[PDB]
Design a binder for this molecule. Structure first.
Ligand SMILES: CCCCCCCCCCCCCCCCCC(=O)OC[C@H](COP(=O)([O-])OCC(O)COP(=O)([O-])OC[C@@H](COC(=O)CCCCCCCCCCCCCCCCC)OC(=O)CCCCCCCCCCCCCCCCC)OC(=O)CCCCCCCCCCCCCCCCC
Ligand SMILES: CC(C)=CCC/C(C)=C/CC/C(C)=C/CC/C(C)=C/CC/C(C)=C/CC/C(C)=C/CC/C(C)=C/CC/C(C)=C/CC/C(C)=C/CC1=C(C)C(=O)c2ccccc2C1=O
Ligand SMILES: CC(C)=CCC/C(C)=C/CC/C(C)=C/CC/C(C)=C/CC/C(C)=C\CC/C(C)=C/CC/C(C)=C/CC/C(C)=C/CC/C(C)=C/CC1=C(C)C(=O)c2ccccc2C1=O
Ligand SMILES: CC(C)=CCC/C(C)=C\CC/C(C)=C/CC/C(C)=C/CC/C(C)=C/CC/C(C)=C/CC/C(C)=C/CC/C(C)=C/CC/C(C)=C\CC1=C(C)C(=O)c2ccccc2C1=O
Ligand SMILES: CCCCCCCCCCCCCCCC(=O)O[C@H](COC(=O)CCCCCCC[C@@H](C)CCCCCCCCC)COP(=O)(O)O[C@H]1[C@H](O)[C@H](O)[C@H](O)[C@@H](O)[C@@H]1O
Ligand SMILES: CCCCCCCCCCCCCCCC(=O)O[C@H](COC(=O)CCCCCCC[C@@H](C)CCCCCCCCC)COP(=O)(O)O[C@H]1[C@H](O)[C@H](O)[C@H](O)[C@@H](O)[C@@H]1O
Ligand SMILES: CCCCCCCCCCCCCCCC(=O)O[C@H](COC(=O)CCCCCCC[C@@H](C)CCCCCCCCC)COP(=O)(O)O[C@H]1[C@H](O)[C@H](O)[C@H](O)[C@@H](O)[C@@H]1O
Ligand SMILES: CCCCCCCC/C=C\CCCCCCCC(=O)OC[C@H](COP(=O)(O)OCCN)OC(=O)CCCCCCCCCCCCCCC
Ligand code: HEM
Ligand code: HEM
Ligand SMILES: CCCCCCCCCCCCCCCC(=O)OC[C@H](C)OC(=O)CCCCCCCC[C@@H](C)CCCCCCCC
Ligand code: FES
Ligand code: FES
Lengths: 535, 382, 382, 53, 53
């Protein structure tokens, strides 16, 4: 009697505790059903998969520089001195059932985590979800992004590899020693000595499996709690206002679709871990200061920092008996990048004057200057990433390596400007298109007038039509406009039988008019609620 | 406007759901089932579709279990029967797992989009500026806690608590971080000129005056005799060889005392050097640095492999251009001239090792680098 | 019974605190200040007392800082000037830190107990069985979510989702734990009788038929020649020596190839053995096990050190009692008889190594243990 | 020495004595025989992240 | 957290060659070596591990 068991368990729960009101509030919480609001969930799900795979990895990983000869199964690396970290990474890859798959899905989850964090940041920035109520949310999310970047750095640096080791040597060691007053001291504190200090990988292992994941988990908890209680913002729409949330309740629909989305994200990541090879360390010999490779790139989320290193033009200053190497330039650049990213909402409000409580998102077209600035920043980030990749770009796409370096150097001040101008004008022209639709109706096929030979596109008005043909223009309300009669009530009733065979006409008619009734009922309910809010 | 003391008994499920929405500030508008018409076969087809997706997920999960437990996993040497099975083993694990969970997710999404009823529930958002009753009551509670405590009236306690907390925090933070803090300039590495700091000294620093440091070539032999003495004739015009600072005392790796000295030589960050043979025809284009004019032994030039910018090895030697390129950040150093950077982030030349030949003709270092060899840092160029 | 729309403006702090308590179900009774009478010098003394405690905390925190920054820390070898300072270095760190924070805590407690007003606030506890409105509305919401979803009507979906989730769960859990699972009976250790399991084989198992396994004494020499061949004359009546299975091929630790075989010998769980010289007077009290009657060489008996119960070494030896005691759980084995347990948790006798002397008189195992030597397990005694 | 002796007693002997799966649990925890080269890394993971989490 | 910043979990054998003289040249695991390093060659490391225990 599962129904009786459920009832008895509910009564016992509500007697021991009293979660009825709280649970009802959680279940009844309404979440907007916009697709772009799942971008953060992608990052959350990738993070969960990262935790689950990282536990498995830590069950088999040994962090240490203790030198050992492999003497494993992988023949191409036998008798070669390597760190125990590399040896156990190879053991995970080869000598544990499914360890290669687990580590590959872990790395793919890391890449998807960074990518989805970037996409979510783009969504919120361009939609203006950081304004008065949620600047703190933006700030903690920026800290979260920085932590994710650096944890991925430490994660692919954990198995001491040739690629990851040379990346560490460059970024960490060089840029740390570069810092003027405390650079060498920071280097010695972090590595416990010179660069190959025998505590580096244990320290990174701790930072990567316990410390940084703990901070990220706490910050994700704060992030999700803030989103939960500062009810999720929404785009302007029929019944959507600054003081309501139009969407679906948590329990019946949102919970089911979020769980299913998590399942599908897990499936995508597992499929990638299977079919796509990620970081094949066995091809990469154990780290040695002398051995190198041509590629020498970090993961894509640090590729922009590496590209900054490459592109910045070798400007070194030599104060009285001292040196200020080119690494400090990039250190300051990264500092500026993070500072501006964290402080943008406050910069935005200082610049514009907006101190209003904003609960309705802005369309990126509707906010041109911010959209232009975001496009400019994305262009700069892409230029830096492809500059880091300039080695492989030059190799495959036959471009001189010097040519790619200087393309990056010039474009990091030219391409941002071009993209800013283009994005600003593009946003304004999207606004112009929206107003054209508002004032003339949707466009359709052309018709030749009866008496004379005029051609008229035979538009379709979206609002009340004047006594004559031309309609009364509507007022823009911040919501997207249907520019195709495709997406309106036109040409949308295929035979509802099946792909290969029809259904009885009575069934088809019943279904089609039932759907018509349901959709017009939804439209009428939204219209009535909209009229009720002010009217 | 009443809590429904006894009407809940006869209130139906729909009425109770509406009441809950009302209490929570949620008004459910157009909660309509997906299949109002009963008995239609489109409903059965959609049912079968979601069932097929869920069953595909289950079959793929069973496939994951069967392949995981029973498949030719385990590395297979090159060109051996079973290599193909091993190579597509992990792909099969990932394919089965991902397909299973993805199909389950697709089935769940289809159930939500086809069977779970459609709603446009609208929740009243009470964001911002809690009602004045709550605000003023919280303010009163906090202010009463602060003032009643009699703080901001015991000046001595106010200052003493601040001093105590500040001193304790100072002591605790300093004791937390002093374990990590180390002096980079503590003289530790022994040298002919007494113990010196690590950054100044590399494997090429003479431990005692007049020590012989051979430019030993690092044969890839796994462990035994990894470094072997080197001769100028071994290199030929337009050739580069990575050499290391090997000492007679640092004999082959057969012993346990050795194979730690050799491991230290191999793992020395500032140890590896590139010995390049400048072509005799191109020897006339060489421009030499101050104090490094006699460093080259005839047409042999020894430059540190560590890039002068962030310290990656600069191994990519290009002959017929005499350019030592670094792969980490694409910086070229003109080997013909003193190895000065002529492109890329680097701004300082690579340190040039003084080389010569000892008795028996083996290549040895004729001294130490006249400058620190790794990447630059604050305490440099003086 | 009204929310005080505009009365809050003139409501005082006490009234607002009472209102908040009322809203939260909290009635603050007897919230009285500690010092109603003003100007008294007992108040000043108590103020100064809490101030003194906080200032002691601050002074001790500064002491922690100064001691940590400037104290003769670092190990001092022994009987060395500075050894006394080092010995109380860490105690001083802990003393200063603990005293500082303890004094801060004492000051805070005294401030609470002497200056913060005393209250006996009583909160209304609404525990158990949320009101029927909430219970029934939650039940209605959950039941509407379940039934409206149309589940428990699509038997094919109900069963397919269960099958899919179960199959995926089982694929995933098996694929998680399967990496860890290893057959303890995979024949891996080579032996004269082919590869055998690790539990069956020890360091005393002859790798090839007729192999010589000397009972090498483990000298404490740090690294070089750790194991040295042994002779019966070395022990004297009532003597115990820990010996290991040393092969001629496992030469001294000078080489890198050696010092790994030797490390394996030292770290072998089942390798160490105790060689006991039974006193000739007491040799007549010896009882011998089935198949172990000729194992002893004259008055030499070689018993495994690993205790038969949980595998700790049984290293303690009592002569004139001939009792091999295990420190882990106080089990004694009668060495006179076959090393059968005559006390403690152990129930199986220690395995007896056959021993003899080869040419030159060096002690060598005359075979292998006729039983598994470590602690017992399921697959044993057959 | 002390703590490793404690491990050898409890974690190894007790685990390996369990009738049906004792040796199987022992080998799966220790990655093989008792002194398996992964015991301390596994305990480190368990002790800094997994169990404290 | 402080201890993890200095601890190295591994059975990889190493000769101490540290500061504690009574254990010099003795084969030990990296775990033991770094625990000794915390005790001796890290300022306040002995105190931190002792207060941890
Ligand atoms: C970690 C990462 C993973 C993800 C985790 C993050 C998830 C966050 C989502 C939040 C959801 C939530 O908390 O809902 C709970 C929610 C609590 O809030 P509520 O009920 O709406 O109360 C009124 C409002 O909270 C009153 O609030 P308001 O609407 O007036 O606005 C005030 C708001 C102001 O807004 C904020 O500032 C909120 C943001 C908080 C900042 C950071 C806090 C979170 C840090 C998390 C760190 C994690 C590590 O302050 C808060 O409410 C803060 C609440 C903090 C909870 C955060 C939870 C995490 O209700 C429940 O408790 C329902 C669950 C009932 C549980 C019992 C079930 C049966 C019992 C069985 C026990 C054993 C059975 C054996 C028999
Ligand atoms: C710092 C910086 C950006 C310097 C400049 C270097 C650079 C990126 C130059 C452009 C590269 C191109 C597009 C070369 C083709 C020749 C060329 C320049 C034609 C004119 C360009 C132009 C305006 C054309 C008009 C039409 C048009 C837009 C054509 C674009 C054609 C292309 C290539 C579109 C895709 C863009 C693309 C993928 C560029 C390469 C970028 C990267 C990082 C690829 C990474 C990558 C590589 C490198 C693999 O080898 C690989 C092997 C197996 C699986 C996966 C991959 C993989 O993902
Ligand atoms: C103008 C205007 C109106 C401004 C608005 C005012 C404003 C700023 C309002 C917001 C207020 C803010 C930001 C408050 C603080 C929020 C905060 C920190 C809350 C606590 C968060 C929390 C719970 C835990 C802490 C998490 C955490 C680590 C947060 C900080 C994240 C950041 C900024 C990390 C930066 C890291 C970084 C690069 C530091 C520079 C130090 C250097 C140069 C180290 C050397 C170095 C290393 C070590 C590398 O690894 C590396 C790798 C690749 C390339 C280069 C380098 C490199 O140079
Ligand atoms: C060889 C080898 C070892 C292979 C294995 C690889 C490995 C090591 C690890 C991965 C293996 C595993 C365990 C994979 C499965 C992972 C997993 C649990 C998937 C669940 C997805 C699934 C099976 C769905 C079935 C379809 C279905 C009926 C769905 C409806 C019922 C379900 C499952 C609902 C789940 C809801 C859900 C995702 C809850 C997450 C809980 C968390 C952390 C946060 C909740 C939460 C969410 C989700 C928000 O979006 C949100 C947005 C704004 C503000 C706040 C929140 C918020 O608090
Ligand atoms: C407000 C606090 C005021 C105090 C300022 C403290 C900074 C001045 C240091 C004074 C001590 C220096 C002289 C004597 C000591 C000396 O010569 O040591 C030096 C290194 O100084 C040390 O000791 C440790 C330095 C202390 C860490 C300080 C942390 C930063 C502070 C300033 C921030 C927290 C304070 C609160 C403000 C923030 C509030 C929060 C908002 C070099 O070490 P070395 O010779 O290589 O030996 C190594 C051994 O030190 C090493 O501990 C050992 O572990 C080895 O690794 C070893 O090699
Ligand atoms: C419901 C699931 C039904 C499936 C039952 C699974 C148990 C039967 C195993 C069938 C495979 C055995 C024959 C082929 C395979 C074989 O001979 O391998 C053996 C070991 O079997 C393995 O493979 C891994 C065993 C699988 C783990 C199963 C986990 C427990 C399950 C039963 C509980 C989860 C199921 C869901 C129910 C719970 C729901 C939650 C409420 C011995 O390994 P060995 O010869 O030493 O080599 C080592 C390599 O295995 C090793 O992976 C490698 O990593 C090395 O370390 C290597 O040395
Ligand atoms: C994380 C790991 C989790 C575990 C997952 C993996 C577990 C897989 C276990 C199944 C694998 C196969 C078992 C292998 C090993 C095995 O178990 O032995 C068998 C035993 O079957 C029998 O007859 C026993 C029944 C007869 C006696 C009746 C006894 C009743 C007892 C059990 C009642 C007490 C229970 C109290 C519980 C107390 C709990 C304490 C908390 C017979 O030997 P056999 O299968 O031929 O294996 C040969 C080796 O015996 C051979 O020494 C070797 O040389 C090889 O040849 C090998 O192949
Ligand atoms: C990849 C790209 C790089 C990354 C880009 C992200 C960084 C943030 C982006 C842009 C910031 C600069 C915006 C442009 C600032 C406008 C200047 C001005 O002249 O002020 C006029 C305003 C309107 O006044 P109005 O009554 O609307 O009348 C209309 C009058 N014509 O005045 C004000 O309130 C504001 C006065 C001063 C505001 C200070 C803002 C900057 C604060 C420092 C933060 C760092 C800045 C980094 C810059 C890159
Ligand atoms: C670990 C990284 C992150 C996780 C797990 C995460 C998760 C989420 C989720 C699930 C949401 C609600 C759904 C949505 O709005 O799409 C959200 C909202 C938000 N995120 Fe994040 N996000 C992350 C990174 C970031 C970054 C890099 C920023 C900058 C940021 C700022 C915000 C803001 C301002 C919101 C509020 C948007 C709203 O109210 O609708 N987050 N986050
Ligand atoms: C939170 C975000 C995380 C990110 C972005 C991340 C990223 C990464 C990446 C990219 C790798 C490289 C994998 C490879 O090269 O095969 C890695 C390795 C590793 N990760 Fe993480 N990780 C995260 C969380 C975790 C957690 C929570 C744990 C522990 C529970 C963990 C444990 C490990 C281990 C042990 C390794 C080394 C395994 C190996 O070398 O193959 N990671 N990490
Ligand atoms: C990372 C931040 C980088 C901060 C650099 C701090 C430089 C301190 C030492 C400068 C110096 O005087 O050394 C001698 C100099 C090299 O030679 C000359 O006297 C003529 C040089 C003409 C070029 C001047 C360009 C100055 C630009 C910077 C002020 C802008 C920094 C932002
Ligand atoms: S690391 Fe060599 S040029 Fe930058
Ligand atoms: S360990 Fe020997 S008696 Fe228990």
């Amino acid at each position: 009697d599962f129904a009786k068991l459920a009832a008895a368990q509910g009564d016992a729960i509500d007697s021991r505790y009293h979660p009825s009101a709280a649970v009802r509030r959680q279940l009844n919480k309404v979440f907007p059903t916009h697709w772009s609001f799942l971008l953060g969930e992608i990052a959350l799900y990738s993070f969960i998969i990262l935790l689950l795979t990282g536990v498995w990895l830590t069950l088999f990983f040994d962090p240490s520089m203790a030198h050992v000869t492999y003497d494993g199964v992988y023949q191409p690396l036998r008798g070669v001195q390597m760190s125990r970290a590399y040896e156990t990474a190879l053991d995970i890859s080869f000598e544990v059932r499914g360890g290669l798959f687990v580590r590959q899905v872990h790395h793919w989850a890391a890449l998807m985590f960074a990518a989805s964090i970037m996409v979510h940041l783009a969504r919120i920035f361009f939609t203006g979800a950081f304004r008065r109520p949620r600047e703190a949310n933006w700030v903690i999310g920026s800290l979260l992004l920085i932590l994710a970047m650096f944890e991925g750095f430490f994660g692919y640096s954990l198995p001491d590899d040739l690629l990851s080791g040379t990346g560490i040597r460059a970024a960490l060691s060089g840029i740390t020693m570069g810092i003027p007053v405390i650079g060498t001291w920071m280097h010695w504190a972090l590595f416990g000595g010179d660069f190959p200090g025998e505590i580096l990988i244990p320290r990174l292992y701790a930072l990567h499996i316990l410390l940084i994941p703990g901070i990220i988990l706490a910050l994700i908890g704060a992030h999700l709690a803030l989103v939960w209680f500062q009810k999720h913002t929404q785009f302007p729409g029929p019944g959507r206002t600054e003081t309501n949330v139009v969407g679906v309740r948590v329990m019946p629909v949102f919970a089911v679709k979020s769980g299913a989305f998590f399942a599908m994200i897990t499936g995508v990541l597992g499929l990638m871990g299977g079919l796509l090879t990620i970081n094949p360390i066995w091809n990469l010999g154990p780290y040695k200061p002398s051995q190198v490779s041509a590629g020498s790139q970090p993961d894509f989320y640090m590729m922009w920092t590496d590209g900054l290193i490459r592109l910045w033009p070798a400007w070194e200053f030599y104060p009285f008996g001292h040196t200020i190497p080119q690494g400090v330039w990039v250190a300051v650049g990264m500092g500026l990048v993070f500072a501006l990213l964290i402080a943008y909402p406050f910069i935005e409000k200082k610049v514009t004057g907006d101190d209003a409580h904003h609960n309705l998102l802005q369309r990126p077209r509707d906010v041109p200057v911010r959209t232009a600035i975001g496009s400019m920043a994305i262009a700069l980030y892409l230029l830096l990433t492809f500059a880091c990749m300039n080695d492989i770009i030059a190799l495959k796409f036959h471009i001189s390596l010097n040519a790619t370096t200087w393309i990056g150097r010039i474009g990091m001040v030219v391409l941002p400007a071009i993209v800013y101008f283009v994005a600003y004008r593009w946003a304004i022209s999207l606004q112009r298109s929206d107003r054209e639709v508002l004032e003339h109706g949707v466009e359709t096929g052309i018709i030749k007038r009866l008496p004379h030979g005029a051609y008229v596109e035979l538009h379709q008005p979206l609002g009340p039509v004047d006594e004559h043909g031309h309609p009364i223009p509507l007022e823009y309300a911040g919501a997207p406009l249907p520019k195709r009669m495709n997406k309106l009530g036109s040409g949308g009733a295929p035979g509802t039988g099946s792909f290969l065979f029809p259904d009885p006409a009575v069934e088809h008619e019943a279904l089609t008019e039932a759907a018509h009734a349901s959709e017009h009922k939804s439209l009428t309910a939204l219209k009535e609620h909209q009229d009720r809010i002010h009217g | 406007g009443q809590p429904t003391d006894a009407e809940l008994a006869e209130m139906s499920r729909e009425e109770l759901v509406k009441l809950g929405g009302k209490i929570d500030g949620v008004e459910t508008i157009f909660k309509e089932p997906r299949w109002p018409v009963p008995g239609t076969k489109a409903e059965k087809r959609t049912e079968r579709l979601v069932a097929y997706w869920l069953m595909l997920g289950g079959l793929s999960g069973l496939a994951l279990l069967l392949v995981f437990l029973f498949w030719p996993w385990e590395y297979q040497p090159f060109g051996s029967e079973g290599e193909f099975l091993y190579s597509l083993a992990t792909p099969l694990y990932g394919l089965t797992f991902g397909l299973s969970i993805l199909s389950i997710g697709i089935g769940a999404v289809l159930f939500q989009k086809k069977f779970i009823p459609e709603e446009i529930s609208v929740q009243d958002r009470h964001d911002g500026r809690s009602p004045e009753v709550h605000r003023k009551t919280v303010a009163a509670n906090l202010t009463d806690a602060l003032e009643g405590s009699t703080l901001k009236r015991r000046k001595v306690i106010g200052l003493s608590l601040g001093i105590g907390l500040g001193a304790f925090g100072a002591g605790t933070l300093v004791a937390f971080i002093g374990g990590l803090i180390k002096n980079p300039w503590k003289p530790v590495v022994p040298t002919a000129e007494g113990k010196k700091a690590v950054l100044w000294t590399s494997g090429w620093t003479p431990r005692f005056k007049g020590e012989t440091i051979y430019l030993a070539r690092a044969t890839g032999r796994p462990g035994e005799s990894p470094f072997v003495k080197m001769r100028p004739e071994d290199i030929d015009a337009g050739g580069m060889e990575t050499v290391f600072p090997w000492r007679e005392s640092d004999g082959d790796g057969t012993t346990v005392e050795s194979e730690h000295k050799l491991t230290e030589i191999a793992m020395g960050v500032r140890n590896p050097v590139m010995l390049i043979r400048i072509k005799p025809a191109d020897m006339h284009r060489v421009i030499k640095r101050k104090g490094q004019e006699s460093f080259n032994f005839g047409e042999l030039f020894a430059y540190t492999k560590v890039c002068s910018h962030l310290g990656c090895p600069s191994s990519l030697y290009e002959q017929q251009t005499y350019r030592i390129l670094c792969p980490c950040h694409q910086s070229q150093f003109d080997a013909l001239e003193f190895a000065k950077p002529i492109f890329g982030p680097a701004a300082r030349a690579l340190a040039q090792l003084p080389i010569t030949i000892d008795e028996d003709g083996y290549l040895v270092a004729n001294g130490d680098f006249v400058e620190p060899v790794g990447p630059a840092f604050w305490e440099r160029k003086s």
